[PDB]
Tab-separated table of C-alpha atoms and ligand atoms in Angstrom:
chain	number	residue	atom	x	y	z
A	1	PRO	CA	-64.098	-179.421	-122.111
A	2	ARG	CA	-66.548	-177.623	-124.617
A	3	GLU	CA	-66.468	-173.680	-124.455
A	4	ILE	CA	-69.564	-171.164	-123.946
A	5	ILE	CA	-68.967	-167.567	-125.238
A	6	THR	CA	-70.773	-164.767	-123.748
A	7	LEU	CA	-72.828	-161.782	-125.236
A	8	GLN	CA	-73.606	-158.680	-123.276
A	9	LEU	CA	-75.794	-156.452	-124.405
A	10	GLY	CA	-77.023	-152.982	-122.990
A	11	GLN	CA	-76.911	-151.816	-119.953
A	12	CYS	CA	-79.083	-154.650	-118.505
A	13	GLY	CA	-76.470	-157.313	-120.606
A	14	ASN	CA	-74.003	-155.975	-119.051
A	15	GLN	CA	-75.029	-155.398	-115.600
A	16	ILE	CA	-76.147	-158.588	-114.883
A	17	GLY	CA	-73.144	-159.725	-116.623
A	18	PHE	CA	-71.188	-157.803	-114.176
A	19	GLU	CA	-72.694	-159.611	-111.913
A	20	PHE	CA	-72.266	-163.088	-113.710
A	21	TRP	CA	-68.181	-162.784	-113.369
A	22	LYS	CA	-68.283	-161.483	-110.386
A	23	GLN	CA	-69.709	-164.588	-109.108
A	24	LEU	CA	-67.829	-167.283	-111.357
A	25	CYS	CA	-64.645	-165.294	-110.259
A	26	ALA	CA	-65.427	-166.133	-106.611
A	27	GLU	CA	-66.285	-169.969	-107.205
A	28	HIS	CA	-63.060	-170.476	-109.072
A	29	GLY	CA	-60.767	-168.939	-106.979
A	30	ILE	CA	-60.043	-166.106	-109.623
A	31	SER	CA	-59.431	-162.372	-108.529
A	32	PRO	CA	-60.611	-159.149	-110.276
A	33	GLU	CA	-57.544	-160.256	-112.616
A	34	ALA	CA	-56.092	-163.589	-112.079
A	35	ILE	CA	-55.673	-166.574	-109.608
A	36	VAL	CA	-54.660	-167.501	-105.703
A	37	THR	CA	-60.293	-179.750	-110.111
A	38	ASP	CA	-62.682	-177.485	-111.830
A	39	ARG	CA	-63.502	-176.438	-115.823
A	40	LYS	CA	-62.680	-173.181	-115.851
A	41	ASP	CA	-62.114	-173.303	-119.441
A	42	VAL	CA	-65.873	-173.881	-120.290
A	43	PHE	CA	-66.278	-170.116	-119.338
A	44	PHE	CA	-62.562	-168.829	-118.618
A	45	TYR	CA	-59.750	-168.217	-121.435
A	46	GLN	CA	-55.833	-169.074	-120.425
A	47	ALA	CA	-53.797	-165.617	-120.587
A	48	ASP	CA	-50.482	-165.407	-122.082
A	49	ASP	CA	-49.222	-164.552	-118.725
A	50	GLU	CA	-50.927	-167.884	-116.860
A	51	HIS	CA	-53.728	-165.419	-115.706
A	52	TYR	CA	-57.412	-165.752	-116.338
A	53	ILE	CA	-60.152	-163.692	-118.555
A	54	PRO	CA	-63.817	-164.286	-119.397
A	55	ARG	CA	-64.559	-165.518	-122.743
A	56	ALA	CA	-66.890	-162.195	-122.566
A	57	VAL	CA	-67.912	-159.633	-125.112
A	58	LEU	CA	-69.577	-156.463	-123.366
A	59	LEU	CA	-71.614	-154.769	-126.205
A	60	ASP	CA	-73.514	-151.422	-125.924
A	61	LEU	CA	-74.390	-148.409	-128.258
A	62	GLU	CA	-73.689	-145.876	-124.904
A	63	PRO	CA	-70.358	-145.379	-122.999
A	64	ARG	CA	-72.151	-145.052	-119.493
A	65	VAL	CA	-72.452	-148.432	-118.127
A	66	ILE	CA	-69.304	-150.519	-119.757
A	67	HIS	CA	-67.101	-146.971	-118.348
A	68	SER	CA	-68.610	-147.864	-115.009
A	69	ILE	CA	-67.350	-151.738	-115.161
A	70	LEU	CA	-64.178	-150.287	-116.527
A	71	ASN	CA	-63.917	-147.652	-113.889
A	72	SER	CA	-64.463	-150.710	-111.187
A	73	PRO	CA	-62.445	-153.293	-109.373
A	74	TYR	CA	-63.348	-155.664	-112.333
A	75	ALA	CA	-61.557	-153.815	-114.921
A	76	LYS	CA	-58.456	-155.462	-115.115
A	77	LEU	CA	-60.441	-158.740	-115.648
A	78	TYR	CA	-61.851	-158.268	-118.918
A	79	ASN	CA	-60.329	-158.576	-122.447
A	80	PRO	CA	-60.262	-154.733	-123.713
A	81	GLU	CA	-60.163	-156.122	-127.034
A	82	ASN	CA	-63.638	-157.533	-126.484
A	83	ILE	CA	-65.454	-154.501	-125.656
A	84	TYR	CA	-67.493	-152.222	-127.945
A	85	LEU	CA	-69.015	-148.961	-128.088
A	86	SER	CA	-71.200	-147.380	-130.886
A	87	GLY	CA	-80.950	-145.457	-129.462
A	88	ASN	CA	-84.459	-146.264	-127.511
A	89	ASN	CA	-85.950	-147.828	-130.279
A	90	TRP	CA	-85.402	-151.617	-131.494
A	91	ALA	CA	-85.335	-150.809	-135.044
A	92	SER	CA	-82.629	-147.959	-133.905
A	93	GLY	CA	-80.896	-150.929	-132.606
A	94	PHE	CA	-81.788	-153.734	-135.348
A	95	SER	CA	-79.990	-150.925	-137.048
A	96	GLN	CA	-76.653	-149.740	-135.601
A	97	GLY	CA	-75.873	-153.869	-135.621
A	98	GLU	CA	-75.471	-154.061	-139.737
A	99	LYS	CA	-73.673	-150.895	-139.329
A	100	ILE	CA	-71.357	-152.425	-136.737
A	101	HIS	CA	-71.752	-155.784	-138.424
A	102	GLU	CA	-68.077	-156.190	-139.124
A	103	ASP	CA	-66.565	-154.679	-136.194
A	104	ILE	CA	-68.439	-156.857	-133.841
A	105	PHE	CA	-67.792	-159.953	-135.301
A	106	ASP	CA	-63.890	-159.352	-135.003
A	107	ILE	CA	-64.114	-159.711	-131.579
A	108	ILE	CA	-67.015	-162.436	-131.672
A	109	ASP	CA	-64.907	-164.761	-134.329
A	110	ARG	CA	-61.642	-164.220	-133.051
A	111	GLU	CA	-62.944	-165.828	-129.514
A	112	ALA	CA	-64.605	-168.323	-131.397
A	113	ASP	CA	-61.289	-169.114	-132.843
A	114	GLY	CA	-59.519	-169.462	-129.280
A	115	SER	CA	-61.963	-172.309	-128.757
A	116	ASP	CA	-60.933	-175.774	-129.606
A	117	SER	CA	-64.672	-176.751	-128.880
A	118	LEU	CA	-66.926	-174.226	-129.324
A	119	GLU	CA	-70.468	-175.371	-127.925
A	120	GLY	CA	-72.359	-172.278	-128.298
A	121	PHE	CA	-73.300	-169.167	-127.279
A	122	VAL	CA	-74.882	-166.920	-124.372
A	123	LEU	CA	-76.662	-163.786	-124.957
A	124	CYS	CA	-77.673	-161.741	-121.714
A	125	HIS	CA	-79.935	-159.059	-122.557
A	126	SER	CA	-83.485	-157.215	-121.843
A	127	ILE	CA	-86.647	-157.735	-124.035
A	128	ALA	CA	-87.690	-154.152	-123.560
A	129	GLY	CA	-85.305	-151.810	-124.204
A	130	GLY	CA	-83.395	-150.695	-127.612
A	131	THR	CA	-79.897	-151.997	-127.611
A	132	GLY	CA	-80.844	-155.319	-125.662
A	133	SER	CA	-83.590	-156.093	-128.104
A	134	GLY	CA	-82.915	-154.537	-130.943
A	135	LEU	CA	-78.976	-155.293	-131.614
A	136	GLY	CA	-79.931	-158.571	-129.738
A	137	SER	CA	-82.466	-159.668	-132.061
A	138	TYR	CA	-79.797	-158.696	-134.829
A	139	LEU	CA	-77.047	-160.962	-133.500
A	140	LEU	CA	-79.335	-163.955	-132.775
A	141	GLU	CA	-80.206	-163.734	-136.576
A	142	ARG	CA	-76.539	-163.548	-137.748
A	143	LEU	CA	-75.106	-165.976	-134.906
A	144	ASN	CA	-78.152	-168.188	-136.756
A	145	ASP	CA	-75.909	-168.233	-140.130
A	146	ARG	CA	-72.084	-167.433	-139.257
A	147	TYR	CA	-72.168	-170.513	-136.562
A	148	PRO	CA	-74.776	-172.770	-138.021
A	149	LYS	CA	-74.405	-175.715	-135.456
A	150	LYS	CA	-73.457	-173.805	-132.447
A	151	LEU	CA	-76.113	-173.949	-129.917
A	152	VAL	CA	-77.352	-170.572	-128.598
A	153	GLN	CA	-78.912	-170.173	-125.229
A	154	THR	CA	-80.462	-166.843	-123.329
A	155	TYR	CA	-80.847	-165.072	-120.359
A	156	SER	CA	-83.824	-162.690	-121.473
A	157	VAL	CA	-84.701	-160.057	-119.051
A	158	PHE	CA	-88.359	-159.468	-119.030
A	159	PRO	CA	-89.656	-155.908	-117.891
A	160	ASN	CA	-91.357	-155.200	-114.628
A	161	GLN	CA	-94.944	-155.827	-115.146
A	162	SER	CA	-94.607	-148.539	-118.110
A	163	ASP	CA	-91.839	-145.559	-118.665
A	164	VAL	CA	-90.404	-146.819	-122.111
A	165	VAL	CA	-93.711	-146.739	-123.870
A	166	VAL	CA	-92.743	-148.753	-126.867
A	167	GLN	CA	-91.599	-151.830	-124.393
A	168	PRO	CA	-94.697	-153.994	-125.594
A	169	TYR	CA	-92.970	-153.225	-129.168
A	170	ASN	CA	-89.363	-154.117	-128.791
A	171	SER	CA	-90.561	-156.977	-126.442
A	172	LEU	CA	-93.007	-158.722	-129.275
A	173	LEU	CA	-90.237	-158.088	-132.106
A	174	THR	CA	-87.628	-160.007	-130.006
A	175	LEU	CA	-89.937	-162.544	-128.585
A	176	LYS	CA	-89.725	-163.494	-132.376
A	177	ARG	CA	-85.894	-163.999	-132.758
A	178	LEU	CA	-86.137	-165.814	-129.515
A	179	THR	CA	-88.564	-168.038	-130.437
A	180	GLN	CA	-86.837	-169.311	-134.050
A	181	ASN	CA	-83.587	-167.965	-133.423
A	182	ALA	CA	-82.730	-169.405	-130.001
A	183	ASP	CA	-82.401	-173.071	-128.602
A	184	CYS	CA	-82.973	-172.034	-125.261
A	185	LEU	CA	-84.747	-169.221	-123.337
A	186	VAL	CA	-83.914	-169.023	-119.784
A	187	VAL	CA	-86.766	-166.366	-118.755
A	188	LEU	CA	-85.849	-163.711	-115.988
A	189	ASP	CA	-88.880	-161.993	-114.842
A	190	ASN	CA	-88.474	-158.600	-113.436
A	191	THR	CA	-91.617	-158.708	-111.652
A	192	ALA	CA	-91.124	-162.052	-109.926
A	193	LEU	CA	-87.690	-160.842	-109.526
A	194	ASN	CA	-89.211	-157.908	-107.477
A	195	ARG	CA	-91.884	-159.438	-105.264
A	196	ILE	CA	-88.942	-161.666	-103.917
A	197	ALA	CA	-86.381	-158.941	-103.064
A	198	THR	CA	-89.305	-156.960	-101.517
A	199	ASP	CA	-91.261	-160.026	-99.708
A	200	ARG	CA	-88.536	-163.301	-99.099
A	201	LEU	CA	-85.816	-160.168	-98.226
A	202	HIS	CA	-87.696	-157.268	-97.235
A	203	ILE	CA	-86.642	-154.346	-99.598
A	204	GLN	CA	-89.053	-151.360	-100.159
A	205	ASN	CA	-87.275	-149.806	-102.809
A	206	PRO	CA	-84.828	-153.142	-104.573
A	207	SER	CA	-82.412	-151.776	-107.043
A	208	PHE	CA	-81.110	-153.588	-109.963
A	209	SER	CA	-77.996	-154.027	-108.397
A	210	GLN	CA	-79.978	-155.970	-105.534
A	211	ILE	CA	-82.092	-157.639	-108.267
A	212	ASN	CA	-79.154	-158.713	-110.665
A	213	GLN	CA	-77.699	-160.693	-107.295
A	214	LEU	CA	-80.581	-163.137	-107.717
A	215	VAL	CA	-80.119	-163.613	-111.345
A	216	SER	CA	-76.488	-163.963	-110.706
A	217	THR	CA	-77.536	-167.128	-108.551
A	218	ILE	CA	-79.334	-168.742	-110.871
A	219	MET	CA	-76.677	-167.871	-114.032
A	220	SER	CA	-74.502	-169.422	-111.677
A	221	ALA	CA	-76.286	-172.620	-110.157
A	222	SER	CA	-77.430	-173.139	-113.777
A	223	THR	CA	-73.867	-174.056	-114.806
A	224	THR	CA	-72.292	-175.791	-111.755
A	225	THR	CA	-72.234	-179.371	-113.627
A	226	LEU	CA	-70.437	-177.645	-116.482
A	227	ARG	CA	-67.855	-176.066	-114.487
A	228	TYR	CA	-67.593	-178.446	-111.782
A	229	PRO	CA	-67.853	-181.558	-114.361
A	230	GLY	CA	-69.073	-184.765	-113.572
A	231	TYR	CA	-69.808	-187.977	-116.215
A	232	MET	CA	-73.705	-186.866	-117.115
A	233	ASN	CA	-74.375	-183.333	-117.724
A	234	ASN	CA	-71.180	-181.936	-118.694
A	235	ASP	CA	-72.346	-180.631	-121.960
A	236	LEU	CA	-74.620	-177.372	-122.079
A	237	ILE	CA	-76.862	-179.098	-124.653
A	238	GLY	CA	-76.967	-182.395	-122.339
A	239	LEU	CA	-79.014	-179.933	-120.296
A	240	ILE	CA	-81.032	-177.962	-122.692
A	241	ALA	CA	-82.134	-180.968	-124.242
A	242	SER	CA	-83.173	-182.765	-121.240
A	243	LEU	CA	-85.568	-179.925	-120.785
A	244	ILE	CA	-86.775	-179.489	-124.180
A	245	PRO	CA	-88.245	-182.512	-126.070
A	246	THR	CA	-89.936	-180.471	-129.035
A	247	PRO	CA	-88.409	-177.132	-130.743
A	248	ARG	CA	-90.181	-173.936	-130.187
A	249	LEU	CA	-91.170	-175.012	-126.415
A	250	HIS	CA	-87.962	-173.729	-125.325
A	251	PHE	CA	-89.043	-170.955	-122.629
A	252	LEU	CA	-87.835	-172.258	-119.176
A	253	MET	CA	-88.367	-170.623	-115.620
A	254	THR	CA	-86.305	-170.835	-112.780
A	255	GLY	CA	-86.386	-170.791	-109.000
A	256	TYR	CA	-84.148	-171.221	-105.952
A	257	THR	CA	-84.404	-172.139	-102.317
A	258	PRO	CA	-82.242	-171.024	-100.143
A	259	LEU	CA	-83.007	-167.411	-100.531
A	260	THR	CA	-82.295	-165.779	-97.328
A	261	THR	CA	-81.841	-166.126	-93.228
A	262	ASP	CA	-78.869	-166.196	-90.718
A	263	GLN	CA	-81.488	-167.398	-87.908
A	264	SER	CA	-80.838	-171.825	-86.789
A	265	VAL	CA	-83.187	-174.053	-88.017
A	266	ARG	CA	-83.528	-177.654	-86.978
A	267	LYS	CA	-82.397	-179.703	-90.163
A	268	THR	CA	-82.700	-178.508	-93.908
A	269	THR	CA	-82.726	-181.806	-96.149
A	270	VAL	CA	-83.120	-182.405	-99.927
A	271	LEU	CA	-86.847	-183.252	-99.014
A	272	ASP	CA	-87.934	-179.775	-98.009
A	273	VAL	CA	-85.589	-178.374	-100.556
A	274	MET	CA	-86.895	-179.914	-103.620
A	275	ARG	CA	-90.474	-179.626	-101.935
A	276	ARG	CA	-89.868	-175.644	-101.868
A	277	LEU	CA	-88.585	-175.831	-105.669
A	278	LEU	CA	-91.966	-176.268	-106.191
A	279	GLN	CA	-93.975	-173.533	-104.504
A	280	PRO	CA	-94.826	-170.815	-107.068
A	281	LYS	CA	-93.279	-168.123	-104.468
A	282	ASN	CA	-89.985	-168.974	-105.158
A	283	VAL	CA	-90.405	-169.511	-109.320
A	284	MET	CA	-89.103	-166.446	-110.568
A	285	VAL	CA	-91.627	-165.880	-112.673
A	286	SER	CA	-94.792	-164.415	-112.398
A	287	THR	CA	-98.129	-166.218	-113.822
A	288	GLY	CA	-102.309	-165.422	-113.520
A	289	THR	CA	-105.779	-175.445	-113.684
A	290	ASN	CA	-104.847	-176.856	-117.137
A	291	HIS	CA	-101.649	-175.827	-117.100
A	292	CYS	CA	-98.640	-177.735	-116.218
A	293	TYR	CA	-94.603	-178.702	-116.785
A	294	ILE	CA	-93.481	-180.523	-119.444
A	295	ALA	CA	-90.119	-181.193	-117.785
A	296	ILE	CA	-88.228	-180.187	-114.519
A	297	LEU	CA	-84.463	-179.954	-114.046
A	298	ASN	CA	-83.577	-179.853	-109.726
A	299	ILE	CA	-79.715	-179.077	-109.604
A	300	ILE	CA	-78.651	-179.840	-105.405
A	301	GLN	CA	-75.365	-178.837	-104.165
A	302	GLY	CA	-73.758	-180.196	-100.937
A	303	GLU	CA	-73.819	-183.074	-99.253
A	304	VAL	CA	-76.963	-185.316	-100.334
A	305	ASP	CA	-76.470	-189.233	-100.748
A	306	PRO	CA	-78.907	-190.146	-103.698
A	307	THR	CA	-80.774	-192.428	-101.664
A	308	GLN	CA	-82.888	-189.709	-99.906
A	309	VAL	CA	-83.421	-188.485	-103.490
A	310	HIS	CA	-85.641	-191.058	-104.021
A	311	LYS	CA	-87.371	-190.536	-101.550
A	312	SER	CA	-88.167	-187.041	-101.628
A	313	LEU	CA	-89.278	-187.772	-105.082
A	314	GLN	CA	-92.144	-190.213	-103.651
A	315	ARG	CA	-93.457	-188.228	-101.230
A	316	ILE	CA	-94.088	-185.719	-104.309
A	317	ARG	CA	-95.617	-188.191	-106.240
A	318	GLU	CA	-97.758	-189.075	-103.575
A	319	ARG	CA	-98.776	-185.395	-102.345
A	320	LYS	CA	-99.688	-184.537	-106.424
A	321	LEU	CA	-97.087	-181.580	-105.575
A	322	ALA	CA	-95.738	-181.418	-109.639
A	323	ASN	CA	-98.691	-181.542	-112.327
A	324	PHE	CA	-96.415	-182.633	-114.968
A	325	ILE	CA	-98.095	-182.964	-118.730
A	326	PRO	CA	-100.942	-185.006	-119.653
A	327	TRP	CA	-99.077	-186.888	-123.104
A	328	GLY	CA	-96.394	-188.400	-121.747
A	329	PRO	CA	-93.335	-189.236	-119.314
A	330	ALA	CA	-93.714	-187.362	-116.409
A	331	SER	CA	-90.619	-186.787	-114.621
A	332	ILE	CA	-88.075	-184.335	-112.654
A	333	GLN	CA	-84.325	-184.217	-113.137
A	334	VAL	CA	-82.077	-184.642	-110.373
A	335	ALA	CA	-78.481	-183.409	-110.298
A	336	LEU	CA	-76.093	-183.316	-107.526
A	337	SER	CA	-73.319	-180.943	-108.174
A	338	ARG	CA	-70.516	-179.857	-106.028
A	339	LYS	CA	-69.392	-176.393	-104.948
A	340	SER	CA	-66.582	-174.436	-105.301
A	341	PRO	CA	-64.005	-175.169	-102.793
A	342	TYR	CA	-65.295	-171.723	-100.910
A	343	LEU	CA	-67.956	-170.952	-98.482
A	344	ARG	CA	-75.875	-176.866	-95.809
A	345	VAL	CA	-78.170	-177.673	-98.986
A	346	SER	CA	-79.053	-175.510	-101.977
A	347	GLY	CA	-81.140	-175.826	-104.553
A	348	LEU	CA	-81.899	-174.767	-108.278
A	349	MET	CA	-84.883	-175.614	-110.622
A	350	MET	CA	-85.293	-175.171	-114.120
A	351	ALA	CA	-88.329	-176.184	-116.013
A	352	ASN	CA	-90.236	-175.947	-119.000
A	353	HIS	CA	-93.619	-175.236	-117.763
A	354	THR	CA	-96.800	-174.335	-120.032
A	355	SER	CA	-98.079	-171.081	-118.070
A	356	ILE	CA	-95.086	-169.745	-119.497
A	357	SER	CA	-97.065	-168.298	-122.428
A	358	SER	CA	-98.886	-165.812	-120.139
A	359	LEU	CA	-96.073	-163.710	-120.429
A	360	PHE	CA	-96.221	-163.605	-124.390
A	361	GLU	CA	-99.906	-163.362	-123.902
A	362	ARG	CA	-99.797	-160.398	-121.866
A	363	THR	CA	-97.317	-158.460	-124.242
A	364	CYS	CA	-99.547	-159.523	-127.276
A	365	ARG	CA	-102.439	-157.811	-125.185
A	366	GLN	CA	-100.585	-154.589	-125.042
A	367	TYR	CA	-99.193	-154.900	-128.411
A	368	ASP	CA	-102.330	-155.050	-129.795
A	369	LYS	CA	-103.849	-152.089	-127.942
A	370	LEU	CA	-100.888	-149.696	-128.957
A	371	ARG	CA	-101.056	-151.027	-132.207
A	372	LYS	CA	-104.642	-150.342	-133.011
A	373	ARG	CA	-103.832	-146.729	-132.417
A	374	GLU	CA	-100.691	-146.571	-134.647
A	375	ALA	CA	-99.392	-145.354	-130.959
A	376	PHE	CA	-95.698	-143.940	-131.025
A	377	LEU	CA	-95.429	-146.011	-134.711
A	378	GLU	CA	-93.167	-142.444	-135.293
A	379	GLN	CA	-89.746	-143.162	-134.406
A	380	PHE	CA	-89.408	-146.765	-135.519
A	381	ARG	CA	-91.133	-146.087	-138.943
A	382	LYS	CA	-87.935	-143.793	-138.948
A	383	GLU	CA	-85.755	-146.580	-140.382
A	384	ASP	CA	-86.776	-149.648	-143.094
A	385	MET	CA	-90.414	-149.822	-141.135
A	386	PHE	CA	-91.877	-148.626	-144.546
A	387	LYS	CA	-94.379	-151.301	-143.651
A	388	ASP	CA	-95.007	-154.379	-141.073
A	389	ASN	CA	-92.773	-157.066	-139.847
A	390	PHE	CA	-94.746	-156.249	-136.852
A	391	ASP	CA	-97.429	-158.521	-137.787
A	392	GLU	CA	-94.932	-161.269	-139.087
A	393	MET	CA	-93.623	-161.145	-135.243
A	394	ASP	CA	-97.020	-161.202	-133.621
A	395	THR	CA	-98.146	-164.051	-135.641
A	396	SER	CA	-95.115	-166.372	-134.871
A	397	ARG	CA	-95.502	-165.145	-131.150
A	398	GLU	CA	-98.952	-166.535	-131.195
A	399	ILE	CA	-97.484	-169.405	-132.540
A	400	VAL	CA	-95.654	-169.976	-129.225
A	401	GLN	CA	-98.825	-169.608	-127.393
A	402	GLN	CA	-100.684	-171.838	-129.654
A	403	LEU	CA	-98.657	-174.886	-128.858
A	404	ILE	CA	-97.600	-174.406	-125.522
A	405	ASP	CA	-101.435	-173.957	-124.609
A	406	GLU	CA	-101.457	-177.252	-127.118
A	407	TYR	CA	-98.962	-178.658	-124.907
A	408	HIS	CA	-100.919	-179.011	-121.690
A	409	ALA	CA	-103.839	-180.751	-123.683
A	410	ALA	CA	-103.673	-184.610	-123.414
A	411	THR	CA	-103.929	-184.566	-127.087
A	412	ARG	CA	-100.770	-182.816	-127.702
B	1	GSP	N1	-82.584	-157.372	-113.434
B	1	GSP	C1	-82.699	-156.051	-114.466
B	1	GSP	N2	-83.392	-155.770	-115.326
B	1	GSP	C2	-82.700	-154.544	-115.945
B	1	GSP	C3	-81.645	-153.930	-115.764
B	1	GSP	N3	-81.234	-152.929	-116.444
B	1	GSP	C4	-82.273	-152.855	-116.667
B	1	GSP	N4	-83.262	-153.324	-116.838
B	1	GSP	C5	-84.993	-153.796	-117.444
B	1	GSP	O1	-84.390	-154.116	-118.564
B	1	GSP	C6	-85.707	-153.354	-119.589
B	1	GSP	C7	-84.527	-152.158	-120.325
B	1	GSP	O2	-83.395	-152.668	-120.603
B	1	GSP	P1	-82.090	-151.669	-120.749
B	1	GSP	O3	-80.974	-151.784	-119.889
B	1	GSP	O4	-82.527	-150.134	-120.611
B	1	GSP	O5	-81.793	-151.736	-122.122
B	1	GSP	P2	-80.912	-151.064	-123.178
B	1	GSP	O6	-80.972	-151.944	-124.339
B	1	GSP	O7	-79.477	-150.788	-122.661
B	1	GSP	O8	-81.409	-149.538	-123.242
B	1	GSP	P3	-81.223	-148.409	-124.465
B	1	GSP	O9	-79.754	-148.134	-124.401
B	1	GSP	O10	-81.985	-148.797	-125.816
B	1	GSP	S1	-82.380	-147.007	-123.887
B	1	GSP	C8	-86.096	-152.735	-118.674
B	1	GSP	O11	-87.640	-153.515	-118.458
B	1	GSP	C9	-85.766	-152.456	-117.094
B	1	GSP	O12	-86.644	-152.867	-115.655
B	1	GSP	C10	-80.607	-154.626	-114.814
B	1	GSP	O13	-79.586	-154.268	-114.369
B	1	GSP	N5	-81.343	-155.699	-114.104
B	2	MG	MG1	-78.347	-148.810	-123.343
């Protein structure tokens, strides 16, 4: 009975958000407007007309994308007063936030009021880009003050592997606000998203639409214990806490099992489901010994019987399929959630793994390069960049890579 307000920034933020609500809607029997026991309250609000609307906030610096949603089959769903429209650069993005502060928080504070027990905020956005990273980083810094206790989680979209030129810039500046101004970071690697769409799906030119179909599934599954509540795992923090033992290190990777087909099989049990959630080919992140997990969560939908589950774990302990940390209790959690009373096993993984730092590394290597040449610094140094906050960020980020690597050490 805890609420979650969702912030959607920039094209990416709003296009994966579009898919997210399209999916939650199908599951809670809600139409592109309203209705036809699950907890709808967590993500939905009761309309003053016995109808339903999402606790969502569409924020963009360009009209193109929001008007796509508005001129679509889901225009009636969104709360009209929760949509806001005001530049390629993080700086430009961080800037326009301060300028639109009051207008933005009028919507955020109002939704915050409606809730009777607000747990926290979820921010959907991309790391590269201007809006997502810039306006995203600003909001992240403000939420950390206007609401000190409320938890903050994000589904952050990492670029593919350019054609923006300064992604490594926007990216570093944001990774900083994601390290200290965020409780939980579900990382969505566009590179890994592609490989899948392409391989385990056979699409030569995977579009964002297509790609966001995957993201929607993870976003959807990773919240099933909150929408189809049980005794344990009903708090968002009930999950995040079990996945993040120490702060800072809160960058999680995900993975899904039943990804394709329609061709039938002889038998699919929770066994091969958990076994697969451990094969890197299903892990939606791209990494390239020593590294290990810090925690692992497995959410299974459909029939199961918690006896079969004890058996799958054993086979794993003996087949050395999961390399956990060396400095402590190596354990994978299982949560048997239901599905919606509308259209076999299904599995979603959420792991806090060490090799996640690779992306942070892969970014600094790029930042550094472009930095050592004063590349494109002219467009950013066009607004309160008469010196360097870049240096502050890079160092912070190097800290994240230091502890994530420091975490695979038995010494830790
Ligand atoms: N998965 C996914 N990634 C997206 C989507 N839209 C953009 N991206 C990825 O996000 C990054 C840029 O996102 P974008 O949506 O341009 O941010 P923006 O802030 O809205 O951009 P701007 O307005 O400053 S130019 C790129 O790495 C791109 O690959 C989307 O709908 N889905
Ligand atoms: Mg945009």
